[PDB]
Amino acid sequence: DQDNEIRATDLPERFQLRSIPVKGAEDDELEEEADWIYRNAFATPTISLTIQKIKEALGFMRNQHFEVPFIAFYRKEYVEPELHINDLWRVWQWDEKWTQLRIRKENLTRLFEKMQAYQYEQRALDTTDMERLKDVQSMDELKDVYNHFLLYYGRDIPKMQNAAKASRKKLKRGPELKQASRR
Amino acid sequence: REHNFQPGDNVEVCEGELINLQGKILSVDGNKITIMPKHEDLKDMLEFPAQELRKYFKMGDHVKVIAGRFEGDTGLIVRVEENFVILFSDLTMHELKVLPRDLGQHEWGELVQLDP
Amino acid sequence: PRKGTHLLKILKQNNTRLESRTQLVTMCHMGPKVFMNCAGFLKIDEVLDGSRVHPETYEWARKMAVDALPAGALEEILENPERLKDLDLDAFAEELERQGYGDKHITLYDIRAELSCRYKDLRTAYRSPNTEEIF
Amino acid sequence: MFYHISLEHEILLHPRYFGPNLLNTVKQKLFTEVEGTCTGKYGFVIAVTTIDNIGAGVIQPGRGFVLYPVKYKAIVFRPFKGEVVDAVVTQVNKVGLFTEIGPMSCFISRHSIPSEMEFDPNSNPPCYKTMDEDIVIQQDDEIRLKIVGTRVDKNDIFAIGSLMDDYLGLV
Amino acid sequence: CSQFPTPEAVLEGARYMVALQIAREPLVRQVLRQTFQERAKLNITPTKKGRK
Amino acid sequence: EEDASQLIFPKEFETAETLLNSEVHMLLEHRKQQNESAEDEQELSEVFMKTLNYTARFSRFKNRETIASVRSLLLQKKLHKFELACLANLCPETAEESKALIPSLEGRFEDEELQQILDDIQTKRS
Known part of the structure; x- marks a missing residue:
């Protein structure tokens, strides 16, 4: 039973339930996190209703593996007075959003890389690959870069993927289901 | 171990000489079960003790849970595994794992408040 | 749920109360990091075990107990605080640079408050409902 | 998938509806009675396209209602x-x-x-x-x-x- | 072509092409999204049902 | 026992005649237009509204003549009235795809002839 392997490990029970698994930091991507969370999670809303502290709180969550209440109660000096218990929960929530954003950006980068290889084998991707994939600072504009890619290359993704599935079968000579016409 | 078999059930023989034979239950008499084998080549009725049969289902069948943790709930089978069938409860719309072996506070018209 | 039910199942099966927080890692199979996280939040009706000071903090609590004049010191201090004003945040902050490695001044604040009264409830005192609430 | 099929329905028409506009009133009662309905037999009856013929109204003995067996062709969506x-x-x-x-x-x-x-x-x-x-x-x-x-x-x-x-x- | 049998039809198709390319450009979307964030009006009217 | 993949349908439905999404769109729009002209205080059902706009999103053809033409040029072949409708609704591009979607087509035609049929249908799309 999954409860047995989940209960056996050394991490908090809520950490295994979380969709995004907790992974260590590198201090540079963590600096980018503290900046990103401050600019997106502590910015003016549309309807009528510290970075150092966030950096330390995130360091506790990703490297020390401390839960929000532990950080609040036993690590007050590091987060207070600019971060309170609810702010720590908000940071712990935004950690998921940041991880998904970064993973999405990476997956799309690898997709663009494959598209360049495909076009070289057969407009083109010259500067937009580095420029736009690195520029994305939010999920909203991420979708823009995805749909922009699909406008030109959306016709060829099925061709490329069906060719990759055939390539795998030929190499042997997974769910290798072909893809729709997408017209 | 008294079985949940009822006429109309699809079953597969799980033990004995006729293993993997599929048929439909016709009658249930204690722990004796009469089934109609499902083959163009076999039309005659067969009787098996209830220990020797197991229910079986295919994806897309519509079924009702008649025992255990969710008894009374119903839904469509979305996937079948040798260990269990996973079905999508029609109205509460949840995935719900179940064993193949299992498939007054108010009165009708009563007035209830809901929100204040 | 997973870790808790396991912990309770063990404690139940053994038929014994937790004499001390160290008993968690000794008797149960919980890892150091979960112990680090929860040990502060688990009460025990070794006298410090029934208070908010964390096991890592026990050395500091013992130090304050000795300076306040160490089970014999603690028990007397727990009955009544000999001197509330005795500690000096500048002295602790200065020694922390070589013994603790950090600006723990608020932690000392909380240790003092804890030694004053073990596990003082922070909820606001109960009050009869206001006429508006009653309505 | 969408299909065009001949279907039949028997509608009970209250005596007060007799009179000159009678048959048009039957046509109109049929549309409101089967359109949008759904059955496991035929699927969803999306819309009635035409009425083939209205059968002879049999006056039910004991109650005044006359029932009209009406045949019609409708657009029906049947999944499989x-x-x-x-x-x-x-x-x-x-x-x-x-x-x-x-x-x-x-x-x-x-x-x-x-x-x-x-x-x-x-x-x-x-x-x-x-x-x-x-x-x-x-x-x-x-x-x-x-x-x-x-x-x-x-x-x-x-x-x-x-x-x-x-x-x-x-x- | 049979998909656009006249200059008028072919020109509308070209307009569609340009319209998509403009509407999908991340830069145009970024500036227009910013424009909707700062200067956006909400209009409301009741339906034939909501009137009652 | 019912499975469209092998062309097995109930006796009650076998005699039915299929309709293309464009065809149904023309019928249903005629119906709504007739609803407006001969105005009477009568209402259109949710099933009709969510079928009209759905058919509008998947109406591969718009010109009334393009529907009759794809239907006629297709029925000139030996397809079942089921394949007649789903190949005009789905508009598969490669013959290999058409056979994947409708397995009944396997061995029914040669791939190059089938591709010819699909190419013809695709040129009719509006």
Whole structure:
């Protein structure tokens, strides 16, 4: 039973339930996190209703593996007075959003890389690959870069993927289901 | 171990000489079960003790849970595994794992408040 | 749920109360990091075990107990605080640079408050409902 | 799939409705009585296109009502196991995709979409994607799905779809 | 072509092409999204049902 | 026992005549237009509305003559009235795809002839 392997490990029970698994930091991507969370999670809303502290709180969550209440109660000096218990929960929530954003950006980068290889084998991707994939600072504009890619290359993704599935079968000579016409 | 078999059930023989034979239950008499084998080549009725049969289902069948943790709930089978069938409860719309072996506070018209 | 039910199942099966927080890692199979996280939040009706000071903090609590004049010191201090004003945040902050490695001044604040009264409830005192609430 | 079929219905008409406009009143009662209805036998009756003939009104003995057996041709949507039909994804959830095929609501369970697909609970809106993000399906996307099962309800039909075959999926 | 049998039809198709390319450009979307964030009006009217 | 993949349908439905999404769109729009002209205080059902706009999203053809033409040029072949409708609704591009969607087509035609049929249908799309 999954409860047995989940209960056996050394991490908090809520950490295994979380969709995004907790992974260590590198201090540079963590600096980018503290900046990103401050600019997106502590910015003016549309309807009528510290970075150092966030950096330390995130360091506790990703490297020390401390839960929000532990950080609040036993690590007050590091987060207070600019971060309170609810702010720590908000940071712990935004950690998921940041991880998904970064993973999405990476997956799309690898997709663009494959598209360049495909076009070289057969407009083109010259500067937009580095420029736009690195520029994305939010999920909203991420979708823009995805749909922009699909406008030109959306016709060829099925061709490329069906060719990759055939390539795998030929190499042997997974769910290798072909893809729709997408017209 | 008294079985949940009822006429109309699809079953597969799980033990004995006729293993993997599929048929439909016709009658249930204690722990004796009469089934109609499902083959163009076999039309005659067969009787098996209830220990020797197991229910079986295919994806897309519509079924009702008649025992255990969710008894009374119903839904469509979305996937079948040798260990269990996973079905999508029609109205509460949840995935719900179940064993193949299992498939007054108010009165009708009563007035209830809901929100204040 | 997973870790808790396991912990309770063990404690139940053994038929014994937790004499001390160290008993968690000794008797149960919980890892150091979960112990680090929860040990502060688990009460025990070794006298410090029934208070908010964390096991890592026990050395500091013992130090304050000795300076306040160490089970014999603690028990007397727990009955009544000999001197509330005795500690000096500048002295602790200065020694922390070589013994603790950090600006723990608020932690000392909380240790003092804890030694004053073990596990003082922070909820606001109960009050009869206001006429508006009653309505 | 949509079909054009001859169907029959027997409508009970209250004596007060007799008189000159009688038959047009039958025509009008028929439309309101079968259009939009749904049955496991024929599917959803989308619209009555024409009325073939109104049978002779048999006056029921004892009660004044005369019943008219009327034959008509209607546009009917009948799903089947094995169908491959275009569907619009209306809501994406942690447990499959909720989509609509014409009037028929349909569901694609998480267990019947390719292994690569995974749910993204925080996208705007939430969506399913592969590990390469090559195909991302969300609300209002068009999906060719294959119906593998169906359940019939009172004036409703619900179907369960799949994306497991070779040419199903997005658009 | 048979998909656009006249200069008028071919020109509308070209307009569609340009319209898509403009509407999908991340830069145009970024500036227009910013425009909707700062200067956006909400209009409401009741339906034939909501009137009652 | 019912499965469209192998062309097995109930006796009650076998005698039915299929309709293309464009065809139904023309019928249903005629119906709504007739609803407006001969105005009477009568209402259109949700099933009709969500079928009209759905058919509008998947109406591969718009010109009334393009529907009759794709239907006639297709029925000139030996397809079942089921394949007649789903190949005009789905508009498969490669013959291999058409056979994947409708397995009944396997061995029914040679791939190059089938591709010819699909190419013809695709040129008719509007």
